[PDB]
Amino acid sequence: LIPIVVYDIYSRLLRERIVCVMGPIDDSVASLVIAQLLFLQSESNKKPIHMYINSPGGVVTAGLAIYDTMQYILNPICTWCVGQAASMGSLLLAAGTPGMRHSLPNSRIMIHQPIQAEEIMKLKKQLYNIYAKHTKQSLQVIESAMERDRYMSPMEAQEFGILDKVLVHPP
Amino acid sequence: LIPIVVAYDIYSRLLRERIVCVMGPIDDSVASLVIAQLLFLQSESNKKPIHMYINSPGGVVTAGLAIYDTMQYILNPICTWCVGQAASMGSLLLAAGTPGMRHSLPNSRIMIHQPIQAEEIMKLKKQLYNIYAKHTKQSLQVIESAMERDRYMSPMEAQEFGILDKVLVHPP
Amino acid sequence: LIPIVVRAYDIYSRLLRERIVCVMGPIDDSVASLVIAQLLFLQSESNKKPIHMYINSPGGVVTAGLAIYDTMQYILNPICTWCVGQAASMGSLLLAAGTPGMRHSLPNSRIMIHQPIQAEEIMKLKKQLYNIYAKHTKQSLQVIESAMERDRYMSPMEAQEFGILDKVLVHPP
Amino acid sequence: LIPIVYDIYSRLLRERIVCVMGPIDDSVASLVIAQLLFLQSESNKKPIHMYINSPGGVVTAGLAIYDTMQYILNPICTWCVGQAASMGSLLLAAGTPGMRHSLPNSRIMIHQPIQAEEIMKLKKQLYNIYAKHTKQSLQVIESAMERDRYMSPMEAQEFGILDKVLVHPP
Amino acid sequence: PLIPIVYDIYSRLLRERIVCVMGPIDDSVASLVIAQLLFLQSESNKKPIHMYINSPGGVVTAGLAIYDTMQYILNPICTWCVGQAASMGSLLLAAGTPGMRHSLPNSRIMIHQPIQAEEIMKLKKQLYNIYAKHTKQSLQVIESAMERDRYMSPMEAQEFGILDKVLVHPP
Amino acid sequence: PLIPIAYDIYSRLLRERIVCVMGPIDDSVASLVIAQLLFLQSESNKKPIHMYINSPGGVVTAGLAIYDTMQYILNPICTWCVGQAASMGSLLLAAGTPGMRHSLPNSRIMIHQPIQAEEIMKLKKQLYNIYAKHTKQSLQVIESAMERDRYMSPMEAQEFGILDKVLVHPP
Amino acid sequence: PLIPIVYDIYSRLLRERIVCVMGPIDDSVASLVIAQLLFLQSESNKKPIHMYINSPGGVVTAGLAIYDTMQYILNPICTWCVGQAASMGSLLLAAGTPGMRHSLPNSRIMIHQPIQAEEIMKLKKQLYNIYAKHTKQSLQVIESAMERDRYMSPMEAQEFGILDKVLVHP
Amino acid sequence: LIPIVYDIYSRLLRERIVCVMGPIDDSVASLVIAQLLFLQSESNKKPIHMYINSPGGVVTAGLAIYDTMQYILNPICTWCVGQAASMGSLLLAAGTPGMRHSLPNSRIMIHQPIQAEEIMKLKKQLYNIYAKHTKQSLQVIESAMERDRYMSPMEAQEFGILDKVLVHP
Amino acid sequence: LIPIVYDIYSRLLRERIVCVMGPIDDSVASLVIAQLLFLQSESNKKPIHMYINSPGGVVTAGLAIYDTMQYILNPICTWCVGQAASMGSLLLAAGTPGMRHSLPNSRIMIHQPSIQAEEIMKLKKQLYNIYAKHTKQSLQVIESAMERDRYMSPMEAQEFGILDKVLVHP
Ligand SMILES: CC[C@H](C)[C@H]1C(=O)N(Cc2cccc3ccccc23)C[C@@H]2N(C(=O)NCCCC(F)(F)F)CCC(=O)N12
Ligand SMILES: CC[C@H](C)[C@H]1C(=O)N(Cc2cccc3ccccc23)C[C@@H]2N(C(=O)NCCCC(F)(F)F)CCC(=O)N12
Ligand SMILES: CC[C@H](C)[C@H]1C(=O)N(Cc2cccc3ccccc23)C[C@@H]2N(C(=O)NCCCC(F)(F)F)CCC(=O)N12
Ligand SMILES: CC[C@H](C)[C@H]1C(=O)N(Cc2cccc3ccccc23)C[C@@H]2N(C(=O)NCCCC(F)(F)F)CCC(=O)N12
Ligand SMILES: CC[C@H](C)[C@H]1C(=O)N(Cc2cccc3ccccc23)C[C@@H]2N(C(=O)NCCCC(F)(F)F)CCC(=O)N12
Ligand SMILES: CC[C@H](C)[C@H]1C(=O)N(Cc2cccc3ccccc23)C[C@@H]2N(C(=O)NCCCC(F)(F)F)CCC(=O)N12
Ligand SMILES: CC[C@H](C)[C@H]1C(=O)N(Cc2cccc3ccccc23)C[C@@H]2N(C(=O)NCCCC(F)(F)F)CCC(=O)N12
Ligand SMILES: CC[C@H](C)[C@H]1C(=O)N(Cc2cccc3ccccc23)C[C@@H]2N(C(=O)NCCCC(F)(F)F)CCC(=O)N12
Numbered sequence A: 001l002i003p004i005v006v007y008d009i010y011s012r013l014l015r016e017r018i019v020c021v022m023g024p025i026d027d028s029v030a031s032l033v034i035a036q037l038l039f040l041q042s043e044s045n046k047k048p049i050h051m052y053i054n055s056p057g058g059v060v061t062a063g064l065a066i067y068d069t070m071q072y073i074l075n076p077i078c079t080w081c082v083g084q085a086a087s088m089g090s091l092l093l094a095a096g097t098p099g100m101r102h103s104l105p106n107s108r109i110m111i112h113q114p115i116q117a118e119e120i121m122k123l124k125k126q127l128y129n130i131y132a133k134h135t136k137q138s139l140q141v142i143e144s145a146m147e148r149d150r151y152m153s154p155m156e157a158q159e160f161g162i163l164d165k166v167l168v169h170p171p
Numbered sequence B: 001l002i003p004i005v006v007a008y009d010i011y012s013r014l015l016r017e018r019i020v021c022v023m024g025p026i027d028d029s030v031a032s033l034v035i036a037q038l039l040f041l042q043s044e045s046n047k048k049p050i051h052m053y054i055n056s057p058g059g060v061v062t063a064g065l066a067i068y069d070t071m072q073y074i075l076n077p078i079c080t081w082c083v084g085q086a087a088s089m090g091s092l093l094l095a096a097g098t099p100g101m102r103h104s105l106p107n108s109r110i111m112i113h114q115p116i117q118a119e120e121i122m123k124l125k126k127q128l129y130n131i132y133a134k135h136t137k138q139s140l141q142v143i144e145s146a147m148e149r150d151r152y153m154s155p156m157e158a159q160e161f162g163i164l165d166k167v168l169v170h171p172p
Numbered sequence C: 001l002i003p004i005v006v007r008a009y010d011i012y013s014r015l016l017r018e019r020i021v022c023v024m025g026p027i028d029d030s031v032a033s034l035v036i037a038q039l040l041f042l043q044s045e046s047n048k049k050p051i052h053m054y055i056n057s058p059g060g061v062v063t064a065g066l067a068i069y070d071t072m073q074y075i076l077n078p079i080c081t082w083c084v085g086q087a088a089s090m091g092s093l094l095l096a097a098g099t100p101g102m103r104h105s106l107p108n109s110r111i112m113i114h115q116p117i118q119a120e121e122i123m124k125l126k127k128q129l130y131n132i133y134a135k136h137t138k139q140s141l142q143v144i145e146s147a148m149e150r151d152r153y154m155s156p157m158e159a160q161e162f163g164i165l166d167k168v169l170v171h172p173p
Numbered sequence D: 001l002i003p004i005v006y007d008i009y010s011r012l013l014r015e016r017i018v019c020v021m022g023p024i025d026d027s028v029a030s031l032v033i034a035q036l037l038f039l040q041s042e043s044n045k046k047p048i049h050m051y052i053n054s055p056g057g058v059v060t061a062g063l064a065i066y067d068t069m070q071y072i073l074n075p076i077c078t079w080c081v082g083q084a085a086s087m088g089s090l091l092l093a094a095g096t097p098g099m100r101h102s103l104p105n106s107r108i109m110i111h112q113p114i115q116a117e118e119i120m121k122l123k124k125q126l127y128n129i130y131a132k133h134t135k136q137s138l139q140v141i142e143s144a145m146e147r148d149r150y151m152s153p154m155e156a157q158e159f160g161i162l163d164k165v166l167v168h169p170p
Numbered sequence E: 001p002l003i004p005i006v007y008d009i010y011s012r013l014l015r016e017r018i019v020c021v022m023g024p025i026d027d028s029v030a031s032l033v034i035a036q037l038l039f040l041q042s043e044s045n046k047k048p049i050h051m052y053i054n055s056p057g058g059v060v061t062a063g064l065a066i067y068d069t070m071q072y073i074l075n076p077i078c079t080w081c082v083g084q085a086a087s088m089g090s091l092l093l094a095a096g097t098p099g100m101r102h103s104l105p106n107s108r109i110m111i112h113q114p115i116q117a118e119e120i121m122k123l124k125k126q127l128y129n130i131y132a133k134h135t136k137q138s139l140q141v142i143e144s145a146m147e148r149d150r151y152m153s154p155m156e157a158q159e160f161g162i163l164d165k166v167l168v169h170p171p
Numbered sequence F: 001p002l003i004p005i006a007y008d009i010y011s012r013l014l015r016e017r018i019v020c021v022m023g024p025i026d027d028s029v030a031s032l033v034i035a036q037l038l039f040l041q042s043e044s045n046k047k048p049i050h051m052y053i054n055s056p057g058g059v060v061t062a063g064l065a066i067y068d069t070m071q072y073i074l075n076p077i078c079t080w081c082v083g084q085a086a087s088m089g090s091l092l093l094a095a096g097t098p099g100m101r102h103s104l105p106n107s108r109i110m111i112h113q114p115i116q117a118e119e120i121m122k123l124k125k126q127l128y129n130i131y132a133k134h135t136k137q138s139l140q141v142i143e144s145a146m147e148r149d150r151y152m153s154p155m156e157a158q159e160f161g162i163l164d165k166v167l168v169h170p171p
Numbered sequence G: 001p002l003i004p005i006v007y008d009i010y011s012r013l014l015r016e017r018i019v020c021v022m023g024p025i026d027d028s029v030a031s032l033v034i035a036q037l038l039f040l041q042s043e044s045n046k047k048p049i050h051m052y053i054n055s056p057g058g059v060v061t062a063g064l065a066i067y068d069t070m071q072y073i074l075n076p077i078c079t080w081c082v083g084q085a086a087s088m089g090s091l092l093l094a095a096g097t098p099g100m101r102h103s104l105p106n107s108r109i110m111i112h113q114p115i116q117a118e119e120i121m122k123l124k125k126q127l128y129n130i131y132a133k134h135t136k137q138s139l140q141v142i143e144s145a146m147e148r149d150r151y152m153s154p155m156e157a158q159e160f161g162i163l164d165k166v167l168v169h170p
Numbered sequence H: 001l002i003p004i005v006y007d008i009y010s011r012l013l014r015e016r017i018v019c020v021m022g023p024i025d026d027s028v029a030s031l032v033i034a035q036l037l038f039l040q041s042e043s044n045k046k047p048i049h050m051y052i053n054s055p056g057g058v059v060t061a062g063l064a065i066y067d068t069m070q071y072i073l074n075p076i077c078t079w080c081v082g083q084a085a086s087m088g089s090l091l092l093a094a095g096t097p098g099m100r101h102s103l104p105n106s107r108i109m110i111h112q113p114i115q116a117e118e119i120m121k122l123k124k125q126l127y128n129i130y131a132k133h134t135k136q137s138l139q140v141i142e143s144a145m146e147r148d149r150y151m152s153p154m155e156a157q158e159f160g161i162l163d164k165v166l167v168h169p
Numbered sequence I: 001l002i003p004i005v006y007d008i009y010s011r012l013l014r015e016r017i018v019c020v021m022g023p024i025d026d027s028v029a030s031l032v033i034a035q036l037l038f039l040q041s042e043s044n045k046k047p048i049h050m051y052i053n054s055p056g057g058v059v060t061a062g063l064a065i066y067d068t069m070q071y072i073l074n075p076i077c078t079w080c081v082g083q084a085a086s087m088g089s090l091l092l093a094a095g096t097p098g099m100r101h102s103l104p105n106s107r108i109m110i111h112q113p114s115i116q117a118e119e120i121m122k123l124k125k126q127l128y129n130i131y132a133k134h135t136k137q138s139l140q141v142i143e144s145a146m147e148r149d150r151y152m153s154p155m156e157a158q159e160f161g162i163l164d165k166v167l168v169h170p
């Protein structure tokens, strides 16, 4: 049951420029997030957008659709990891505007990922290049890390280049 | 949960700005909704461009062709935008946008390969060959060869092939 | 999800205000009743102004198709039929039943008159279909019978030659 | 089942009461977090009341709510009615000091009913959070969490999970 | 349903030339019955075969397959209606050797029948001709009777030409 | 569904060189029929094999597997249509040894048929050539007939070249 | 599906050195085929083994398990395609003893293929090398052909090196 | 349908071949253990051949088979055909030294696809078993088991999981 | 698929080995009890071997097997392979003193995972008394240990009195 304010709660957050990326990312979630990003951009192409991320991952092309839209719009995008960002969720976290990528202290971050053979490898290489661009790590290090079935703490994710700030309280 | 803006749900709000969404598998229900939206936008103005957002793995051939024919029939220019993917019938719709107005974002994947009686399935397949030839400007022989290859193309390859005009990282 | 336009219409209701009725998907009793109710509404708004009938359907229940057919004939309005995607089985009967001169298809549509209760009753219904197609296409009963046994689709051009429709348009005239 | 006019829960939300009920998963956590952000923007000083009746749920979803409670500036009064087990008892214990309550017949459990290394890392995060808010040593928290049992409100007060056991308002 | 052994009980009855046509008649039942008729014929093409019929009907082509095999073999076939013979069941009852078609006293018999249109009519006309042949009634009378949704007593079925003898006790 | 004796009636028929092709033809049915044809062949490569066919059709490649095995073995094969032979069932009926293709009088026979596009057409053309070979009709006539959604009587199927003899009683 | 007896019919065929590879190839099918190959080898390591193949394909590692066992045993193995051999089925067909790979005239043969990303590519490359070895075609030609979604006639498969003989009669 | 000659697996059992196929659960473990006890009583000296084609399964069921292999006196030749992942690769590695084999196209994975403390205790038992049979350090075993990947037979030989990669006898 | 030699379990039964595997319900208990009666009538002196690999099960079904083990005159050697949890560990502990074994990697749990309230407590107290009798620990220590949600290694189970011998080899 989604509560209302006199607007359902998510719509109310949307009016304050907060977009929620929650649960598994599929085509339906991607389209909704993209539609919300277009809406916020037309209200103002300068004011920051806040992206709340609590997700175990999802479909690669759906994640990439959101990724490309984030890059395409002019707005700065602050990413916030609460709970977890695994697989495509961690890619979206890392794709926030430099300096504006955040996690709360107990979140868990995973870049490991839990079609023809050639196509699955082409998509995998696209992920390598995107993580390399945003984290500043080499392709070899990205590949090694993505093969490891383990989560990182927020501090480790900061050291790796996935995020900028680990906040307990506002600054 | 579909979010609302103030009462419009997010897609209806996009529709008021002349953006139509073609998302997920294309069946008769999706085709009818898209067609109804195209008729609405045309009556508001038969000159102002229409934006078509495409993120689809494909679908039913006749439903795809219904949308295709309606796109051609209306007078408006139609800008097509590939985000995520356009496979099978999705890539046909992408290619059918107004010349010069067919776009993809940088990490999209495009497939023209295709994943009721035998004679009828071949007749539909030949209709697809002729439509791709018209809009890509490639020969029928090249279309037939390419459609037999089970693979995706990058946006740059799709541009070289004639499926789209522009690969944009940021607006122009 | 059906989109809305603003004073709140869903998109099909908005099309209905412009005299467009949609016959989409399989035709059953529920679809027939909705289409019939819409035809009665449009008639009372004006019994002279044309009605546009959008048809994209693989067919359906014979008596439900016949209910829509009879209502189309009964109202006074001219009815323009438009085949987009496909009109198979009962869908092609409705297409053929539009006002003469006002039956249209877009260029890539597919049209089928082949059809994919006690034995005597199924034959009686089949003969009613033969007579309706004969009336509207102007073909003989023998030719209708032969054609309906062939499991195939027709292009819009072939359907025009056969008498199912009048005009194949790429763009408005 | 939900009575109308605007449902009862939205009406409670207008009085700064947030409900954490049933199993805690990602969907529940997101709703609770969204409500906490709403109440904070209405006023970052006025207290928030958190009603907790829950058998527990997903660890990361519980931790997401925990972190948001700490992050906002408001004081948060926690109220245990019925039960607070597993992640539910962590949220109860995480209320503002002096403002953690239970009604008299509630049951409280800190026992907990992914790769091996990851389940242990999450378990150690829970140990440190309970130690911080209860003021008990890590060794005592670990021992208590291995015992499959519930505590009465009085026992939970003695342990440091809550501050007040009320039969009637003060 | 546990089948008792002595051979299972149906196999034991088969060794004494008794074939059972029970329940709905589909392709599987028809094949079984046909296989049994071929077996009994090879043991002796002169000795009578007893066919026990208790059936609400079934698939027309499967019924016709059994019918044609009954006619094809040389043996006399005694048909016995116990419980009921409806639709295709009553056709098989009527198709027994003349003089050898029986019912017990409380059985119920129905000739009413509870693919493209043209094909269903062609099959229906094949049924008309078969009933006319074995009952000795006109085609017009068969067609009228088959439109009536009702059962007949054994005595009425005897008068109509579906069977020869209604026995309470052996003769 | 209970077969009678375990040593069922179908195995007993197999010992007399009768193979049953019943119900929908899929890979499992084709393999069983093929295995039985190999068995009968090794018992004697001269003695005829009887193939009982009551089938609404099935998978094209499974039908073709049985077809090719029938041609490959050296035995004469008598085909018998009881009930119906539709789609791939009618192909098997037509593929019996010339002069040895039979139907009982009330059977129904259909040649109409109720993967990439190019592949479905290649298989369809293989069916055209097989029917042309065994019926002696032209490719154009086969193609026209297979588009018509209808059944044929045994007499019509005889005239068309699908079978040789329509028997009410043995010769 | 009732299996007839004489021995069930497949066991009877096994006594004449005929092994059946039918339907989708999974771990259960592979283990049965492997067990049968070990049995026939111990009866005689010289007498040929006949392998009947009618299969749309299946699990790659299960197909490779059968492949490796075929190579490992000393017996000559005659492969017979009836109906179809697609994906892993066509690999087994091609892996028969040279000169002893057969198809009946109306069979259809497909080498196109209808886990982490790196692992699926490693398995795909193992398939390329196996087809190259047994067909005598270059790796580049195998890779190009496997990307085309289409079937080959028995004659085309013979020309390609997948089989040696297309027989209408024994 | 399992063919008869004995069903085919029973026939292989009479030649001292035991099959460990598909997912390993309690039912599979009990059957394998029962077969190992049978073969041991026929002769406690003659080798036993263990065919392994398995994606893994339940840890305690794998450990039950492991302990029984060690407990009996017989030499045990392990054979990887198709794959040995997770608990399957542990059983492969637990064969008698010098008698651990793979065919050339097999895939081998030591990565693994109840309370928190208990899952770690079981994990540490696996670390010590792999260390014993491969001769690698505990630190290297731990690192390798976190990597979600398969090894070729040659890599598995270099790592100490098996002794011989044979194309032909 | 159960192999034949007798199916393999029946063959083991002829050598006085009874298998208690998987979840223990009424059906399993009745089969085990029937086997114990059979072995007893063959000889009331010769030992019986009980193989235990079980996560637990229904309390009354476990108690039925327990009572029958005590009732017959034979010595009973218990063998834990894989695991013995809940009712499984009770049966392990109930073997003849000196004849209770585990292999080295087994896991043993006496905690119960996760009828009127009074009845569930009566059954729980029956378990306390049975464990006290066979382990020789005080009932207070049994009750405390059974509240801890954890497994024991074979060595710890030996120290606790659950079993007598941890063997790597005969
Ligand atoms: C960043 C958007 C730029 C400026 C631009 C443009 O690139 N596209 C194409 C487009 C179309 C569809 C999906 C897309 C997804 C990602 C990127 C581009 C997409 C349409 C958009 N429009 C709106 O946003 N209109 C107002 C939005 C308010 C609303 F309420 F509708 F949300 C129409 C006017 C327009 O110029 N653009
Ligand atoms: C391109 C449409 C042209 C101009 C034309 C015409 O071809 N058709 C027929 C038609 C009917 C039904 C479905 C069709 C699908 C594809 C193409 C044509 C279809 C109806 C339309 N009308 C409306 O659009 N009316 C306003 C509708 C929009 C709104 F939502 F706003 F109400 C009525 C005035 C009219 O003649 N035409
Ligand atoms: C062609 C309709 C004529 C004129 C006539 C008539 O035959 N019937 C009977 C009738 C009843 C019900 C279903 C029918 C289906 C098919 C044919 C006739 C049916 C009702 C109709 N009415 C309306 O439609 N009234 C306006 C309603 C407008 C609204 F907006 F509400 F839809 C009431 C005035 C009236 O006498 N007739
Ligand atoms: C404690 C929140 C601080 C103050 C701060 C901030 O860090 N985030 C980031 C953020 C984003 C998304 C999820 C988060 C979860 C936990 C913590 C931070 C999260 C958004 C917030 N905003 C609002 O809530 N604005 C008022 C609107 C609230 C209402 F519900 F009414 F819409 C936008 C301006 C702003 O400063 N912040
Ligand atoms: C009445 C049967 C006649 C005499 C004749 C004949 O037409 N067919 C063909 C046939 C084949 C298959 C199904 C048929 C169905 C209906 C009619 C004929 C059918 C087989 C039979 N055979 C047996 O039954 N042989 C003895 C076997 C006895 C057994 F116990 F096994 F059933 C083979 C030798 C033979 O001459 N015929
Ligand atoms: C007509 C078959 C010829 C003669 C020949 C041959 O082509 N194959 C290959 C083959 C193998 C597998 C499936 C096949 C399907 C279609 C065609 C050929 C097939 C094996 C057969 N054998 C048997 O049938 N042996 C008798 C055993 C029969 C029984 F059931 F009783 F066990 C082994 C000796 C032999 O020469 N051939
Ligand atoms: C080609 C097998 C060779 C010759 C060799 C050998 O490598 N293995 C190991 C082995 C074990 C298990 C699966 C295997 C799969 C593929 C390859 C090897 C496999 C067992 C076999 N044995 C038997 O087959 N014994 C007779 C069995 C006959 C029966 F009828 F029972 F099946 C035992 C002694 C022996 O020399 N080998
Ligand atoms: C290697 C077993 C040793 C030698 C010894 C022993 O430790 N156990 C205990 C035991 C019991 C139950 C399961 C066990 C699982 C793993 C390890 C030990 C197990 C019983 C076994 N027996 C048999 O195997 N008997 C022959 C069986 C032959 C048959 F054909 F039936 F399978 C009874 C005579 C005997 O000395 N032992």
Ligand SMILES: CC[C@H](C)[C@H]1C(=O)N(Cc2cccc3ccccc23)C[C@@H]2N(C(=O)NCCCC(F)(F)F)CCC(=O)N12
Pocket (backbone or CB within 6 Å): I033, I034, I037, I038, I039, I040, I041, I068, I071, I072
């Ligand atoms: C420990 C059993 C004692 C000795 C005694 C006795 O108490 N009961 C009663 C009884 C009955 C049923 C279940 C029981 C379960 C637990 C305890 C007692 C049970 C029957 C048994 N009998 C057998 O076992 N007879 C030989 C059996 C041979 C067979 F192979 F079939 F098992 C009949 C003669 C007899 O003296 N008793």
Ligand SMILES: [Mg+2]
Pocket (backbone or CB within 6 Å): I069, I070, I071, I072, I073, I074
């Ligand atoms: Mg005793």
